[PDB]
Design an enzyme around this catalytic site. Structure first.
Site, PDB file in Angstrom:
ATOM      1  N   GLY A  11       0.812  -1.223   0.000  1.00 13.00           N
ATOM      2  CA  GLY A  11       0.000   0.000   0.000  1.00 13.00           C
ATOM      3  C   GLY A  11       0.833   1.254   0.000  1.00 13.00           C
ATOM      4  CB  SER A  12       3.503   2.405  -2.294  1.00 17.96           C
ATOM      5  OG  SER A  12       4.378   3.495  -2.323  1.00 17.96           O
ATOM      6  CG  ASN A  13       2.131   6.997  -2.622  1.00 12.45           C
ATOM      7  OD1 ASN A  13       2.932   7.802  -2.178  1.00 12.45           O
ATOM      8  ND2 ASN A  13       2.262   6.421  -3.804  1.00 12.45           N
ATOM      9  CG  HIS A 108       3.264   5.006 -14.001  1.00  7.87           C
ATOM     10  ND1 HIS A 108       3.261   3.627 -13.979  1.00  7.87           N
ATOM     11  CD2 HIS A 108       4.218   5.364 -14.896  1.00  7.87           C
ATOM     12  CE1 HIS A 108       4.175   3.169 -14.819  1.00  7.87           C
ATOM     13  NE2 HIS A 108       4.754   4.205 -15.406  1.00  7.87           N
ATOM     14  CB  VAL A 143      -1.941  -0.889 -17.833  1.00  9.30           C
ATOM     15  CG1 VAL A 143      -0.759  -0.407 -16.966  1.00  9.30           C
ATOM     16  CG2 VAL A 143      -2.712  -2.029 -17.146  1.00  9.30           C
ATOM     17  CE  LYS A 170       6.836   5.084  -3.708  1.00 13.52           C
ATOM     18  NZ  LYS A 170       5.684   4.339  -4.388  1.00 13.52           N
TER      19      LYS A 170
HETATM   20  C1  DXZ Z   1       0.435  -1.737 -10.237  1.00 19.84           C
HETATM   21  S1  DXZ Z   1       1.178  -1.820 -11.880  1.00 19.84           S
HETATM   22  C2  DXZ Z   1      -0.268  -1.939 -13.008  1.00 19.84           C
HETATM   23  C3  DXZ Z   1      -1.545  -1.342 -12.314  1.00 19.84           C
HETATM   24  C4  DXZ Z   1      -2.617  -0.972 -13.327  1.00 19.84           C
HETATM   25  C5  DXZ Z   1      -3.883  -0.264 -12.754  1.00 19.84           C
HETATM   26  C6  DXZ Z   1      -5.029  -0.737 -13.627  1.00 19.84           C
HETATM   27  C7  DXZ Z   1      -5.777  -1.883 -13.315  1.00 19.84           C
HETATM   28  N1  DXZ Z   1      -5.513  -2.594 -12.194  1.00 19.84           N
HETATM   29  N2  DXZ Z   1      -6.769  -2.299 -14.123  1.00 19.84           N
HETATM   30  C8  DXZ Z   1      -7.070  -1.641 -15.263  1.00 19.84           C
HETATM   31  N3  DXZ Z   1      -8.034  -2.068 -16.066  1.00 19.84           N
HETATM   32  N4  DXZ Z   1      -6.363  -0.501 -15.601  1.00 19.84           N
HETATM   33  C9  DXZ Z   1      -5.343  -0.061 -14.811  1.00 19.84           C
HETATM   34  O1  DXZ Z   1      -4.730   0.948 -15.159  1.00 19.84           O
HETATM   35  C10 DXZ Z   1      -0.479  -3.399 -13.456  1.00 19.84           C
HETATM   36  C11 DXZ Z   1      -0.136  -3.836 -14.726  1.00 19.84           C
HETATM   37  C12 DXZ Z   1      -0.365  -5.163 -15.080  1.00 19.84           C
HETATM   38  C13 DXZ Z   1      -0.919  -6.077 -14.200  1.00 19.84           C
HETATM   39  C14 DXZ Z   1      -1.162  -7.506 -14.598  1.00 19.84           C
HETATM   40  O2  DXZ Z   1      -0.809  -7.939 -15.696  1.00 19.84           O
HETATM   41  N5  DXZ Z   1      -1.754  -8.259 -13.687  1.00 19.84           N
HETATM   42  C15 DXZ Z   1      -2.043  -9.680 -13.965  1.00 19.84           C
HETATM   43  C16 DXZ Z   1      -1.517 -10.621 -12.859  1.00 19.84           C
HETATM   44  C17 DXZ Z   1      -0.624  -9.904 -11.832  1.00 19.84           C
HETATM   45  C18 DXZ Z   1      -0.503 -10.679 -10.466  1.00 19.84           C
HETATM   46  O3  DXZ Z   1      -1.389 -10.529  -9.564  1.00 19.84           O
HETATM   47  O4  DXZ Z   1       0.490 -11.451 -10.377  1.00 19.84           O
HETATM   48  C19 DXZ Z   1      -3.536  -9.949 -14.169  1.00 19.84           C
HETATM   49  O5  DXZ Z   1      -4.358  -9.208 -13.604  1.00 19.84           O
HETATM   50  O6  DXZ Z   1      -3.826 -10.934 -14.864  1.00 19.84           O
HETATM   51  C20 DXZ Z   1      -1.282  -5.644 -12.953  1.00 19.84           C
HETATM   52  C21 DXZ Z   1      -1.042  -4.322 -12.595  1.00 19.84           C
END
Ligand code: DXZ
Length: 205
Positions: A11-13, A108, A143, A170
């Site tokens: 929970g950064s921030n 970000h 994202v 940060k």
């Molecule tokens: C904290 S870095 C960023 C956060 C993106 C915030 C966000 C979000 N969570 N959902 C949408 N639709 N749009 C967004 O901008 C991010 C980028 C990619 C992932 C991702 O590929 N997650 C994967 C698995 C990750 C895991 O829990 O190991 C998934 O959900 O299938 C997860 C988070």
């Protein structure tokens, strides 16, 4: 405005956000912190601050929409107005993001649109920029996409490591994430029908 923070880890921030809501003229209260992972540090931060928490395990749901619908139901129960993401690591479904359009914010550690994705501090250093920063934006389906609310430039210093640059960014995040939340919570900044940021003059003085 009643505020939820969604987390997956430290929970950064979150403490920055909590501290800001306890200021005299705050327009926001943090009313719930939701993690998809049990016993992570950000839950302990919330609990130590006396904020309710919930844990919702994606593995208990057949798919992403059902999981996100469970999150939404908690947000519904707690009468939440605004969501902040703080290291939430599951991609939120199109239906969830649509519902929360203009009321869900995240941060970000770059000046978007530069250095999308993970490891933005390493990307900055590898690239050799002299100016980076952080960006608070409304969350979109894609994202790192989504309308920008606030940005603050941060210098890269000769000799910086990932660690020293990360702590400098940060410190900027600790400033701008709560500032952006207050803008959205007060209604000073709202997402227009046209999908662009609107800076609103409020009737109430
Ligand atoms: C904290 S870095 C960023 C956060 C993106 C915030 C966000 C979000 N969570 N959902 C949408 N639709 N749009 C967004 O901008 C991010 C980028 C990619 C992932 C991702 O590929 N997650 C994967 C698995 C990750 C895991 O829990 O190991 C998934 O959900 O299938 C997860 C988070």
């Amino acid at each position: 405005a009643r505020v939820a923070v969604l987390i997956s880890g430290t929970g950064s921030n979150l403490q920055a956000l909590i501290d800001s809501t306890r200021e005299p003229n705050s327009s926001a209260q943090i009313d719930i912190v939701i993690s998809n992972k049990a016993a992570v540090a950000g839950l302990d931060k919330a609990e130590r601050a006396g904020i309710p928490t919930r844990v919702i395990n994606h593995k208990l749901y057949k798919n992403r929409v059902e999981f996100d619908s469970a999150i939404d139901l908690v947000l519904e129960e707690f009468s939440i107005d605004i969501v902040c993401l703080a290291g939430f690591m599951r991609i939120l479904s199109g239906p969830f993001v649509q519902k929360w359009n203009g009321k869900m914010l995240n941060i970000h550690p770059s000046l978007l649109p530069s250095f999308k994705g993970s490891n933005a501090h390493e990307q900055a250093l590898e690239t050799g920029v002299t100016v980076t920063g952080c960006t608070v934006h409304f969350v979109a389906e894609d994202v790192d996409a989504g309308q920008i609310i606030l940005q603050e430039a941060v210098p890269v210093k000769r000799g910086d490591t990932v660690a020293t640059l990360s702590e400098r960014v940060k410190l900027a995040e600790h400033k701008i994430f709560p500032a952006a939340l207050q803008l959205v919570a007060s209604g000073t900044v709202q997402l227009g029908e046209n999908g662009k940021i609107c800076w609103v003059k409020e009737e109430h003085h």
